[PDB]
Amino acid sequence: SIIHIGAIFEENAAKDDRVFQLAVSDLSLNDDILQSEKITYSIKVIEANNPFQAVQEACDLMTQGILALVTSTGCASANALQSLTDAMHIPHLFVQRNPGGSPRTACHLNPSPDGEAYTLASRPPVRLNDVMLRLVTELRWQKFVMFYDSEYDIRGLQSFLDQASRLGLDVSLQKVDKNISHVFTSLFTTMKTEELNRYRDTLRRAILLLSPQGAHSFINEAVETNLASKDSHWVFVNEEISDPEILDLVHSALGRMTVVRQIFPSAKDNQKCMRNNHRISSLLCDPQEGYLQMLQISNLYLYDSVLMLANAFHRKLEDRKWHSMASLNCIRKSTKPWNGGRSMLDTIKKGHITGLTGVMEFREDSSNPYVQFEILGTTYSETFGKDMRKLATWDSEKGLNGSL
Amino acid sequence: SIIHIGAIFEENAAKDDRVFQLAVSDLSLNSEKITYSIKVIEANNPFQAVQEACDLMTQGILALVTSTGCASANALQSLTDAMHIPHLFVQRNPGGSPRTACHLNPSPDGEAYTLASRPPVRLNDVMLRLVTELRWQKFVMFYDSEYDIRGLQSFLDQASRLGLDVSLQKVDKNISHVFTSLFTTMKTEELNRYRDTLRRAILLLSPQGAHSFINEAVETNLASKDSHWVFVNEEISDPEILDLVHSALGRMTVVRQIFPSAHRISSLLCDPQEGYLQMLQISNLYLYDSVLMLANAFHRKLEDRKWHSMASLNCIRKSTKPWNGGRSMLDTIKKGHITGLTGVMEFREDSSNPYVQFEILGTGKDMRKLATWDSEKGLNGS
Numbered sequence: 005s006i007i008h009i010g011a012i013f014e015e016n017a018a019k020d021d022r023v024f025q026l027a028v029s030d031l032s033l034n035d036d037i038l039q040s041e042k043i044t045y046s047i048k049v050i051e052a053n054n055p056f057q058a059v060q061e062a063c064d065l066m067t068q069g070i071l072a073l074v075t076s077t078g079c080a081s082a083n084a085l086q087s088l089t090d091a092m093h094i095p096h097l098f099v100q101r102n103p104g105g106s107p108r109t110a111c112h113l114n115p116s117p118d119g120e121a122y123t124l125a126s127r128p129p130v131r132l133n134d135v136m137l138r139l140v141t142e143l144r145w146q147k148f149v150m151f152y153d154s155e156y157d158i159r160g161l162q163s164f165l166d167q168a169s170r171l172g173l174d175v176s177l178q179k180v181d182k183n184i185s186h187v188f189t190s191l192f193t194t195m196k197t198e199e200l201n202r203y204r205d206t207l208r209r210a211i212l213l214l215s216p217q218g219a220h221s222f223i224n225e226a227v228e229t230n231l232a233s234k235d236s237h238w239v240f241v242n243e244e245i246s247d248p249e250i251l252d253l254v255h256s257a258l259g260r261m262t263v264v265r266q267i268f269p270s271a272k273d274n275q276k277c278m279r280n281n282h283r284i285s286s287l288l289c290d291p292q293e294g295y296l297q298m299l300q301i302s303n304l305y306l307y308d309s310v311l312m313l314a315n316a317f318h319r320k321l322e323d324r325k326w327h328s329m330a331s332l333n334c335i336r337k338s339t340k341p342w343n344g345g346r347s348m349l350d351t352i353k354k355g356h357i358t359g360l361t362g363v364m365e366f367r368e369d370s371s372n373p374y375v376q377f378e379i380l381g382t383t384y385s386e387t388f389g390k391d392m393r394k395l396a397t398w399d400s401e402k403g404l405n406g407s408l
Numbered sequence: 409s410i411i412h413i414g415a416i417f418e419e420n421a422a423k424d425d426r427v428f429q430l431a432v433s434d435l436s437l438n439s440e441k442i443t444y445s446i447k448v449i450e451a452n453n454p455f456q457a458v459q460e461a462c463d464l465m466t467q468g469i470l471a472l473v474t475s476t477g478c479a480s481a482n483a484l485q486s487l488t489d490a491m492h493i494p495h496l497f498v499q500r501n502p503g504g505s506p507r508t509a510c511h512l513n514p515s516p517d518g519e520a521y522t523l524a525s526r527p528p529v530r531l532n533d534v535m536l537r538l539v540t541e542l543r544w545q546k547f548v549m550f551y552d553s554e555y556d557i558r559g560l561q562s563f564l565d566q567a568s569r570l571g572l573d574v575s576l577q578k579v580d581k582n583i584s585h586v587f588t589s590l591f592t593t594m595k596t597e598e599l600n601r602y603r604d605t606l607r608r609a610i611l612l613l614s615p616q617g618a619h620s621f622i623n624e625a626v627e628t629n630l631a632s633k634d635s636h637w638v639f640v641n642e643e644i645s646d647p648e649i650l651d652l653v654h655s656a657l658g659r660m661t662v663v664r665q666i667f668p669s670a671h672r673i674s675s676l677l678c679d680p681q682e683g684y685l686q687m688l689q690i691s692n693l694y695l696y697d698s699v700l701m702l703a704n705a706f707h708r709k710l711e712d713r714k715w716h717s718m719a720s721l722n723c724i725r726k727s728t729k730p731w732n733g734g735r736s737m738l739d740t741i742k743k744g745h746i747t748g749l750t751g752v753m754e755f756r757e758d759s760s761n762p763y764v765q766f767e768i769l770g771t772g773k774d775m776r777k778l779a780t781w782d783s784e785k786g787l788n789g790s
C-alpha cells in the first residue's frame with residue numbers, strides 16, 4: 005500500500021512547498037526503512053486569514069485518505085483546522101507561521117475532548133517571556149516601556165506581566181501603529197515641550213516587540229525626531245531576525261541595543277549523515293551552501309515535522325501494526341472519524357528525531373519543549389563601525405549561560 | 409416559503425432558541441411569513457459551525473443569524489464572506505467574563521458580510537474617565553482566566569499618555585489557589601507591600617468570580633477598609649451587585665450596561681411576561697433585535713421590488729458562485745434602523761452598532777446610582 009499525507013500552506017507558500025517536497029524526496033532516496041514503501045502527498049495552497057478555505061481544502065484531503073495533515077498557517081486557520089482534525093481523528097502537525105515578521109504568540113486553540121486532541125504544535129512554546137524577565141532583572145530596570153506592533157498578540161505577555169507585577173516593576177505597554185510617521189507626528193502634536201522632554205527620558209529603557217523592519221523604521225523615526233539618545237538601551241525581542249537585519253538596527257541606533265533571537269544546534273551528525281564512506285544527499289546532511297540561511301524558522305520545523313512522521317511510519321510498520329485510511333468528506337454531516345487516528349497519533353507523540361532544529365519530541369502536554377536563544381549586545385570600532393556581539397545563551401533545559 | 413433565514417446557536421442554546429422564535433412570532437402578528445432553520449452546535453467548535461452553516465446554505469437562506477463565541481464567529485465570518493450571505497453575529501458572554509470584541513479576518517473591499525449586533529466595547533472609555541476623576545495614579549487591574557486583554561489596548565495607550573502606572577494581574581479560575589500562592593512565595597514585607605498596592609484596583613472579572621475574589625481577599629486579610637475596587641463588566645444583575653457590596657470591606661464601584669424601558673401589543677418588546685426579561689442575558693436582547701433588523705430589511709427590499717430569491721449554495725465545489733442577492737441585501741440591512749429591547753439599533757459604514765450606555769454605581773452607605781455614560785454625550789453626573 006501507500007503512505008499518503010496532506011499538506012496545507014498559506015500564501016506565500018513557495019518556500020514551504022519547496023521544503024516539504026525536499027523532505028519527502030530526501031526520505032524516499034535515503035530512508036532505508038521506508039525503502040520499498042511508497043510515499044505520496046497532496047499540497048493545498050490557501051489564502052492567508054481564510055479559515056473557510058482551509059476547511060474546504062482539508063476536507064478535500066480527507067477524501068484522499070491521509071494518515072496525517074501537516075500545516076503551516078496563521079492562527080485563524082490553525083484554530084479551524086484544529087477543530088476539524090479533532091473531529092476526524094486526523095493527526096495534525098501544525099507549524100505556526102511568522103506573523104508578518106512580528107514576534108510570535110502561540111495560537112489560541114479550542115478545547116479538545118479528553119484523549120482526542122489531535123493537534124501537535126511543532127514549534128516550541130514561546131519562551132521569550134523567560135528571557136525578557138532575566139534580562140530586565142539583571143539590568144536592574146524598575147521602569148520601562150514595551151513597544152509592540154499592530155500584529156503582536158499581547159496575550160503572549162501574560163506570564164511576563166504577572167511576574168513583573170510580583171517584582172513590583174512598572175511596565176508601560178504601548179502599541180506602535182503601522183504608520184510610524186504618524187505615530188511620532190502625533191507625539192509632537194499632542195504633547196507640550198515639557199511633557200515631550202519627559203517622555204524622551206522614559207524611552208531610555210524599552211523593549212521592542214516588533215518585526216525587524218518595523219524596528220528599523222521605529223529607530224530611524226526616533227533618531228530623526230530627536231527622541232532617541234545615546235543614553236538609551238533598547239532590547240529587540242523576536243525569535244526571528246537575520247544578521248543583515250540586525251546590522252540595520254545597530255547602524256541606526258544611537259544608544260545601546262540588545263537582541264534576543266532563536267538559534268539552532270550545528271547539525272554535524274557525522275557518520276549519521278555518512279553511508280559507505282559517502283555523505284548522504286539530503287537537506288539535513290548535505291545542505292547547499294547558503295540555502296538554510298534563506299529559509300525562515302517555520303521552514304526548518306516543517307522539514308523536521310516530516311521526519312517526525314516518517315519515524316512514526318517506521319515504528320508503526322515494524323510493530324506490524326497498521327490501519328488503512330478510509331475515504332471521508334467531512335463537510336458532510338454524516339462523516340465518521342478515522343478509526344486508525346488515535347493509534348497513529350499516539351505513535352507520532354512517542355517519536356523522537358534529530359533534525360534541522362535539533363531534537364524534536366512531544367511531551368504529555370503535546371508540546372515540543374526545546375528552544376534556545378542567543379543574547380547579543382552592541383559593540384563599536386572605528387574600523388568596522390557598529391557591530392553586535394554574543395553575550396549569552398538561554399535554553400529551556402539549563403536556562404542562562406553567560407553574563408549580562 | 410420565500411423568506412427563509414438560518415440560525416446557529418452554541419450550547420447552551422435554550423434561551424437563544426426560545427427568544428429567536430419569539431421574535432419571529434411577535435412579527436407574524438403584524439402575507440409572506442419568515443421561516444427558519446435553527447442549528448445547535450457545541451461551544452468552541454468552529455468546524456461544526458461550518459458544517460451546519462453549509463447545510464443551511466444548501467437549503468438556501470437570505471441571511472445567517474448566529475450567537476457564538478469568537479472561534480466559531482471567525483470561521484463563520486470567513487464562510488459568509490465567501491458566499492455573500494449577510495451575517496448578523498451576536499457575541500456570547502464568555503462565561504460571564506468581561507467582553508472583548510472578536511478578532512475577525514480581513515474582508516475584500518466592500519464585501520464584509522458580518523454585522524456585529526452588540527456595540528463595540530466602550531468600557532475602556534468609562535474606565536479612563538473614572539480613574540482620572542478618582543485621581544488614581546497607581547492601580548491594579550485584575551482580569552480572569554477567560555478575559556482577552558487585547559481588549560484593553562486603547563485603555564493602556566491612553567493610560568501611558570497620562571503617566572498612570574497600571575499593573576495587569578491574571579486571576580486564574582481556581583480562586584483558592586490564587587492567594588495561597590502569594591503567601592508561600594513572598595516575605596512578610598513583600599506581602600505587606602502587595603497589600604498596599606491593592607487599595608486601588610479594577611476588577612475585570614465575572615460577577616461570581618468577583619464575589620469569590622473579594623471573599624478570598626477579606627479572609628486572607630489582603631482587603632482593607634481603606635480600599636476602593638471598581639467592578640467592570642457590561643453584564644451583572646442587581647442581586648449580583650448586592651453580593652459584591654455585602655462582601656466588600658472597602659468602597660465599591662460598579663460599571664455596567666443599561667437599556668431603555670419600552671390596546672397594548674402582544675410581544676416580548678411591548679407586553680413583557682412578568683419575570684421573563686429578568687431571565688434573559690444581554691445577548692438574548694440583541695438576538696431579538698437582530699431579527700427585528702432583518703424583518704425591517706426584508707420589508708424595504710420587497711417594497712422597492714429589488715428582491716433576489718435565495719440560492720442553493722454548495723461549500724464543497726469551489727466552483728460555486730456566491731449569492732447574487734447578497735450584496736444588495738447586506739446594503740439594505742446596513743441602511744436599516746429599528747427600536748427594540750436594547751433601544752435603537754443601526755449600522756454605521758464601519759458596520760458597527762454604535763450606541764451603548766452604562767451606569768456607574770458607588771459604595772447605610774449602600775450602593776446607589778452616581779452617573780451614566782453613553783457613546784453620544786459621554787459622562788453625565790459625577
Ligand SMILES: *[C@@H]1O[C@H](CO)[C@@H](O)[C@H](O)[C@H]1NC(C)=O
Pocket residue numbers: 182183184185186
Ligand atoms: C504613512 O503616512 C505618510 C504621510 O501621510 C505616507 O507618506 C506613507 O505612505 C504612509 N504609509 C506608510 C507605511 O508610511
Ligand SMILES: *[C@@H]1O[C@H](CO)[C@@H](O)[C@H](O)[C@H]1NC(C)=O
Pocket residue numbers: 402405406
Ligand atoms: C555554556 O557556554 C559556554 C561558552 O561560554 C560553552 O562552552 C558551554 O558548553 C556552555 N555550557 C552550558 C552548560 O551551558
Ligand SMILES: *[C@@H]1O[C@H](CO)[C@@H](O)[C@H](O)[C@H]1NC(C)=O
Pocket residue numbers: 582584585
Ligand atoms: C484548586 O486548587 C486546590 C488547591 O490544592 C486543588 O486541591 C483543587 O484540586 C483545585 N481544583 C481544580 C478543579 O483543579
Ligand SMILES: [Cl-]
Pocket residue numbers: 178179180187
Ligand atoms: Cl508611541
Ligand SMILES: [Cl-]
Pocket residue numbers: 153154180181182183218
Ligand atoms: Cl509597525
Ligand SMILES: [Cl-]
Pocket residue numbers: 147148205206207208209
Ligand atoms: Cl527609564
Ligand SMILES: [Cl-]
Pocket residue numbers: 296297299300301304
Ligand atoms: Cl534559519
Ligand SMILES: [Cl-]
Pocket residue numbers: 399400401402403
Ligand atoms: Cl529554565
Ligand SMILES: [Cl-]
Pocket residue numbers: 114115116117450451452453
Ligand atoms: Cl468542543
Ligand SMILES: [Cl-]
Pocket residue numbers: 079080083478479482511
Ligand atoms: Cl480565532
Ligand SMILES: [Cl-]
Pocket residue numbers: 532558559560561562563
Ligand atoms: Cl481597544
Ligand SMILES: [Cl-]
Pocket residue numbers: 577578586590
Ligand atoms: Cl494575584
